[PDB]
Amino acid sequence: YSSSETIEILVKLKPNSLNRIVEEFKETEEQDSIENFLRLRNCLHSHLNFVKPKGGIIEFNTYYEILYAWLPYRRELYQKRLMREHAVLKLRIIMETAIVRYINESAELNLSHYEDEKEASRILSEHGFPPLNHTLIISPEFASIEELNQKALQGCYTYILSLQARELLIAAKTRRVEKIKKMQARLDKVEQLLQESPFPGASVWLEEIDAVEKAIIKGRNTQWKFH
Amino acid sequence: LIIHGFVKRLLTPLIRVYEKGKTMPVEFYYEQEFDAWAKKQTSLANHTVKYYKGLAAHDTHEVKSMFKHFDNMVYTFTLDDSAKELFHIYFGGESELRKRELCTGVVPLTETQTQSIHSVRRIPCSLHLQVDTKAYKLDAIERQIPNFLDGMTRARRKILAGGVKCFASNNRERKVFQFGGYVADHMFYHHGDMSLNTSIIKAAQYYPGSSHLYPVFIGIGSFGSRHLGGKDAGSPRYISVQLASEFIKTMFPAEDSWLLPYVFEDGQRAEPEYYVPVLPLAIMEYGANPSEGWKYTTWARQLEDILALVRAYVDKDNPKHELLHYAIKHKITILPLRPSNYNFKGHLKRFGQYYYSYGTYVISEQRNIITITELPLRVPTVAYIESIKKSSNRMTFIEEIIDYSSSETIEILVKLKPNSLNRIVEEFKETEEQDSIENFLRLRNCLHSHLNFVKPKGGIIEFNTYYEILYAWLPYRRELYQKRLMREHAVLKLRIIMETAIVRYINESAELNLSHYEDEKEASRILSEHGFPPLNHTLIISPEFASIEELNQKALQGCYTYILSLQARELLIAAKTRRVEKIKKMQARLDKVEQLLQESPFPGASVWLEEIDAVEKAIIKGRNTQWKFH
Amino acid sequence: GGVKCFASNNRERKVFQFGGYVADHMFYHHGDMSLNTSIIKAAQYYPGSSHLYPVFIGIGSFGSRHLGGKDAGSPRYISVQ
Amino acid sequence: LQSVDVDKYTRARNAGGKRAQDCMLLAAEGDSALSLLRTGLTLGKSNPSGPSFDFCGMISLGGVIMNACKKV
Amino acid sequence: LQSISKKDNHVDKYTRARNAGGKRAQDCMLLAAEGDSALSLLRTGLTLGKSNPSGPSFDFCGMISLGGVIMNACKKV
DNA sequence: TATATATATATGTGTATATATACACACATACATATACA
DNA sequence: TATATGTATGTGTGTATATATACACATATATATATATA
């Protein structure tokens, strides 16, 4: 008589057979006679055999060993994501605090007068604009920090020559100024929480603990449907 | 038991449409009811449409709602005296009743019948047969019979559209099951996955005697052979396909796929109602299917006959120009339209009102061995050998029958019992139409056609000759050329108008001083005062499917976004030279277009001859490279 | 492949269509029946299933406790998200 | 030449007995439909007004039925 | 019991070579493939009659399917 | 030799399902093989 | 005549390897089956 998710099983006994069950299927202090009759216990017996990084079997003895092996990988991963974020923030501050002064000075720089983009790149480099790799500052995908600070200051003037004329208005200047302010504040926060105790990025991982826990609660409440 | 009431059914939804916010959806039981409801709407970008093929697609929070009301949705069948003839029509052993009922469409349901069914919950059996079973049989005709314009079914048209879109960026090959998942995702295919993969396999085969003489895809792997009739291909896990790109480029031109009526499924468009190729591809391949009521069977025509007929229709200084138009007015035949003999080495004869195809043997009395070297058209090898083995009257003269054939060329070897060449001739008599050996060895067949197609806007159509199919095909391609030239004319005028204001903004940006202004409002106001036209930049750059009234009706109703997303890269002088020369090329193209809209005998008559020559050289290149296009 | 596929909008797919996607873009070099069985058993959620925190939300018939989750639908019926 | 039972069939508890006439056979098309019907006929206390296996059965139609109107 | 169930013993995929079990039987090979698509490949290959004049053919070569994965006997003996 | 059945095959686009093998190990069911005897 | 005691089978989980089958629909062809003729 079971439900879709609930067990309900009904046996029927021939008359005068409970006492034969009690005297015939004996009772120890680990399992009952009725549970010995109806197959109602099992052992939770484990075989903790995993594979390790860079290939190969590893065999653990208890779950504490697995937890203690797990922790330093996550610790070091927080450290390297904070180093990457610090580098990208400095590089983007450097990138936009050339674009804003180009908007301030392009009314009399008058780039419409020049012939092609080589003359334009020459006259932009003759007034102190930094050559930048725009397609890797704005989208660091799988670049490590060595090849981030190694090949990004060695680009061209594509960041400044591919601006739309919509960008040259006063509200866009205002928005770029406040966005520079927000990136400066975020760079200060990144350098402030690189130095914390015990290891770098110790409060961020507490926040992610809290978010995962409430997402697990909200998924258990909705029968894992997330209504 | 149908009288007293024993046979019942549930009634579940096929479509549920969910509005955002409301906790009761709108349920539909039929597909055309959903399409009629949906096309009346104005924007469907806050609804979700679910299609339920099978009962197992219903999740938990709606099976609970379906089974709180289980006894509310069980219906019981009754029958009257008007029902026995309908069961004999729909399910009896003769098709003429089924042909003459099945031509007319479905008859809708009255208000009294609908209120009676949805109130007392009983169904007449005849009223079930005259809606549900008839709608099934019309849908099965639509799925299993080809259109006469493009020559392909509905599944193969979905495969062609999804394959043009899948291999767009780079023509890298994929497995058959991965391409099948793509075309079932993006073309809204509502059926099983096994038959789709079978159609993708058979839509790419190329061997002597295959169905498709000009396949859409290049097949990479093992795709079966003559000797089992293509039934021994690989699994879809193994083999691959890619798009035969230049044949699809020349036969189905890409700027004509914007101008076709499309099949809308679940709210957004899926594929065309029909393609219109440059050549009449419906009569250029093979085919044999049953369906409901009718039968489909074709035998392909010569390529040179079709090229002669189309070039005689279109090209004005061919000698057979006005005489062919006379023959189209009076439905008489002048230029011959023969069966195709390509990739077939036997011979073809016409005896009365049919064609016959013959094999080829090679008699020898030195070793009493007949060496069969070819079978008739579309005859598999092992089926022929087992058929020549089962017949007990023919087995009394042979010792052993051995195969030595290659993978593309027949070579069968028989062995006769000693001194038995003489006894064949009195047993198997030689008529004038076939030899005694060809009577003995089953070496001819009749080419008997059933030219039953479907037409645009649905429904069967039935021709009597291949000339009728060609004469029905030609005007569609004519008007589609006229449509593409008029659309191009409108777009070219509008693009000249667009770029000869970009040029003057580049010339006057220093005097205009765009940086001084506050936002897009003041910039659009100060650009409206100096004589810049308001334009619709998206419709000019990408006029996707816009008809010409839509294209000149919402074009002058935009803003200055065309001029405001200019990069500072293109304010340079080489960019000015580039834009001025491309404006010159566009207006020269506009003069060429408005000169093409006038010529004899109809507008766009030289472009279509050029495309005939392009399709011909692509077919020749494909036939030389074993359809690999190396 | 599921993070890559459902990026734009979290619109449902079938099991065999999502399996074709993750065999194309993740360079899977094996059969399709085992991949579709893996997707099905990665989406299941019932008392006593393997996963307590599944990657996907399953939409359709994904089996019950009683037959051990071996009573799901065919992959042309059921959906994941 | 003269010289098992039912496949994919779940009987009701009251088939062929004293209340035989008040039982249903919910004949489905395959086995995924029977998985749906098994899911739904076992709403235990969440649906006191719905049916269950005390008066309902299940059997599969095997895909497409053979017609008898032209094999007789 | 054997006679009751001998009718179900008496369908494998096997293409017999022309010279299997005769006077030149030891000149012959048996190309045991793994499935049916493999046999499609091998039957395509062994029939290149004049595109491969130095190749093999069905005069001294057979085909059979290994049926997926072979049972081991080391754990069942 | 004739007029007459009733079953039988093949084509494309559809509807549904079936089954063999490897790999490890805790657990369940079937004797059966003795060893005191009796 | 009960007892152990060493044998032999037997499903079961995930990730692999290779296959199998029923049904609908039209029409042309077929190969043996059948009266009654006698």
CA–CA separation, B328 and B442 (whole Å) = 40
Please tell me whether residue B567 adopts helix, strand or coil conformation.
strand
CA–CA separation, B246 and B622 (whole Å) = 9
How many CB atoms within 10 Å of residue B629? 15
| Helical spans, DSSP H, in B529-627 | 537-541, 548-553, 561-564, 573-596, 607-624
Please give residues of chain C from 8 to 67 whose alpha-adjacent beta carbon (CB) lies under 7 Å from any atom of strand G. Answer: 30-31, 33-35, 37-38, 41, 50
**Are D38 and C71 inside 8 Å of each other by CB?**
yes
Element (DSSP H or E) covering residue B426: helix B422-427
Closest residue (CA) to C1' of nucleotide G16 is C34
CA–CA separation, B111 and B89 (whole Å) = 26
- CA-CA distances (angstroms) from residue B426 to A180, B388, B429, B439? 104, 19, 6, 12
Structural tokens at position B90: 């729909």
Judging by DSSP bridges, how do beta strands A49-51 and A57-59 pair with one another?
antiparallel
Catalytic, B517? Answer no
The whole-number Å distance from D65's CA to G21's C1' is 15
Cβ contacts of B142 within 8 Å, gap of 6 or more: B154, B454, B458
Q: How near does any CA of chain D get to the CA of A2, in Å?
A: 7
Closest CA to B261 of B74, B438, B480, B465: B480
Closest CA to B70 of E51, A57, A59, D43: D43
Element (DSSP H or E) covering residue B288: strand B287-290
Q: How near does any CA of chain C get to the CA of B255, in Å?
A: 29
Beta bridge partners, B76, equal B8, B122
Tell whether B219 lies on the interface with E, counting CB pairs under 8 A.
no
CA–CA separation, B351 and B31 (whole Å) = 49
Kindly tell me whether chain E and chain C come into contact, counting contact as 3+ Cβ pairs under 8 Å.
Answer: no
**Is the CB of B192 less than 7 A from some atom of nucleic acid strand G?**
no
| Helical spans, DSSP H, in B124-231 | 125-128, 134-144, 154-166, 176-186, 194-202
Cβ contacts of B496 within 8 Å, gap of 6 or more: B583, B586, B587, B590
Q: Which amino acid is at B612?
A: I
CA–CA separation, E3 and E8 (whole Å) = 10
Judging by DSSP bridges, how do beta strands E29-33 and B122-124 pair with one another?
unpaired
DSSP state of B371: E
Q: What is the DSSP string of B315-364?
A: -TTSTTSHHHHHHHHHT---S--PBP-TT--SEEEE-SS-EEEE-B----
CA–CA separation, B273 and B571 (whole Å) = 46
CA–CA separation, B53 and B337 (whole Å) = 45
- CA-CA distances (angstroms) from residue A134 to A153, A178, A204, B566? 9, 21, 30, 19
Contact predicate E30/E65, CB 8 Å: no
- Scanning E10-49 for CB atoms below 8 A from B yields 36-37, 40-41, 44, 47-49
- CA-CA distances (angstroms) from residue B34 to B40, B106, B399, C58? 10, 16, 66, 26
**Is the CB of E69 less than 7 A from some atom of nucleic acid strand G?**
yes
Q: How near does any CA of chain D get to the CA of A3, in Å?
A: 5
Q: What is the DSSP string of B519-542?
A: SHHHHHHHHHTTTPPPB-HHHHH-
How many CB atoms within 10 Å of residue B453? 20
Half-sphere exposure at residue D26, Cβ-oriented, CA atoms within 13 angstroms: 25
Structural tokens at position B205: 């085969």
3-state secondary structure B142-157: HHHCCECCCCCCHHHH
Contact predicate E54/E5, CB 8 Å: no
Structural tokens at position E22: 């005769």
Tell me whether residue A112 is exposed, middle or buried, using C-beta atoms within 10 angstroms of its C-beta: 0 to 12, 13 to 18, 19 or more: middle
- The number of helices, as runs of H, and strands, as runs of E, in chain A is 9, 2
Judging by DSSP bridges, how do beta strands C79-80 and D56-60 pair with one another?
unpaired
Beta bridge partners, B301, equal B339
CA–CA separation, B361 and B358 (whole Å) = 10
Contact predicate B452/B460, CB 8 Å: yes
Sign of CA dihedral B522, B524, B525, B530: positive
Tell whether E9 lies on the interface with B, counting CB pairs under 8 A.
no
Contact predicate B517/B526, CB 8 Å: yes
Closest CA to B469 of B337, B334, B351, B564: B337
Contact predicate B556/B534, CB 8 Å: yes
Q: First CA to last CA across chain E, in angstroms? A: 24
Judging by DSSP bridges, how do beta strands E61-65 and E29-33 pair with one another?
parallel
Closest CA to B333 of B465, B210, B428: B465
Element (DSSP H or E) covering residue B76: strand B75-78
Experimental method: cryo-EM
Resolution at which this structure was determined, Å: 4.8
How many CB atoms within 10 Å of residue B285? 20
Sign of CA dihedral B337, B341, B347, B348: negative
DSSP state of A132: B
Q: Can you tell me which residue has the tokens 């989406």?
A: C43
Please tell me whether residue B1 adopts helix, strand or coil conformation.
coil
Say what the alpha-carbon torsion angle B51, B52, B53, B57 is, to the nearest 10 degrees: 130
CA–CA separation, C67 and D35 (whole Å) = 10
Structural tokens at position C55: 């990657």
**Are D40 and B63 inside 8 Å of each other by CB?**
yes
Closest CA to C3 of C31, C27, C25, C34: C25
Specify the long-range contacts of residues B310-313, CB closer than 8 Å, at least 24 apart.
B310/B279, B310/B280, B310/B474, B310/B612, B311/B609, B311/B612, B313/B474
**Is the CB of C74 less than 7 A from some atom of nucleic acid strand G?**
no
CA–CA separation, B553 and B283 (whole Å) = 41
Tell me whether residue A187 is exposed, middle or buried, using C-beta atoms within 10 angstroms of its C-beta: 0 to 12, 13 to 18, 19 or more: middle
CA–CA separation, B492 and B587 (whole Å) = 8
- CA-CA distances (angstroms) from residue A155 to A122, A151, A152? 14, 8, 6
Judging by DSSP bridges, how do beta strands B122-124 and B174-175 pair with one another?
unpaired
CA–CA separation, B217 and B201 (whole Å) = 10
**Are B91 and D70 inside 8 Å of each other by CB?**
yes
Q: How near does any CA of chain C get to the CA of B27, in Å?
A: 18
CB contacts of E37 in chain B (<8 Å) are 222, 234-235, 238
Closest CA to B456 of B271, B601, B273: B273
Contact predicate B506/B576, CB 8 Å: yes
CA–CA separation, B477 and B274 (whole Å) = 12
Q: Which amino acid is at D17?
A: G
- CA-CA distances (angstroms) from residue B436 to B195, B401, B432, B441, B444? 43, 19, 10, 9, 12
Judging by DSSP bridges, how do beta strands B240-243 and B217-220 pair with one another?
antiparallel
Kindly tell me whether chain C and chain D come into contact, counting contact as 3+ Cβ pairs under 8 Å.
Answer: yes
Closest CA to A163 of B505, B578, B500, B571: B571
**Are B222 and E44 inside 8 Å of each other by CB?**
yes
CA–CA separation, B394 and B568 (whole Å) = 87
| Partner residue facing D39 (CB), from C64, C74, C77 | C64
CA–CA separation, D41 and D43 (whole Å) = 6
Structural tokens at position B398: 């042979």
Chains with ≥3 Cβ pairs under 8 A against B? A, C, D, E
- CA-CA distances (angstroms) from residue A90 to A78, A95, B459? 19, 9, 69
CA–CA separation, B106 and B341 (whole Å) = 43
**For residue B97, which phi and psi values (nearest 5 degrees)?**
-60, -40
Beta bridge partners, B401, equal B414
**Are D35 and C74 inside 8 Å of each other by CB?**
no
CA–CA separation, B216 and B166 (whole Å) = 13
CA–CA separation, B537 and B501 (whole Å) = 13
The whole-number Å distance from B356's CA to G36's C1' is 38
Q: Which amino acid is at E40?
A: S
DSSP state of B139: H
Cβ contacts of A185 within 8 Å, gap of 6 or more: none
Closest CA to B140 of B90, B84, B94: B90
Q: Rounded to 5, what percent of chain A is helix, strand, coil? A: 60, 5, 35
Please tell me whether residue B245 adopts helix, strand or coil conformation.
helix
- Scanning A186-225 for CB atoms below 8 A from C yields 216, 219, 223-225
CA–CA separation, A35 and A28 (whole Å) = 11
Preceding amide of B108 cis, omega within 30: no
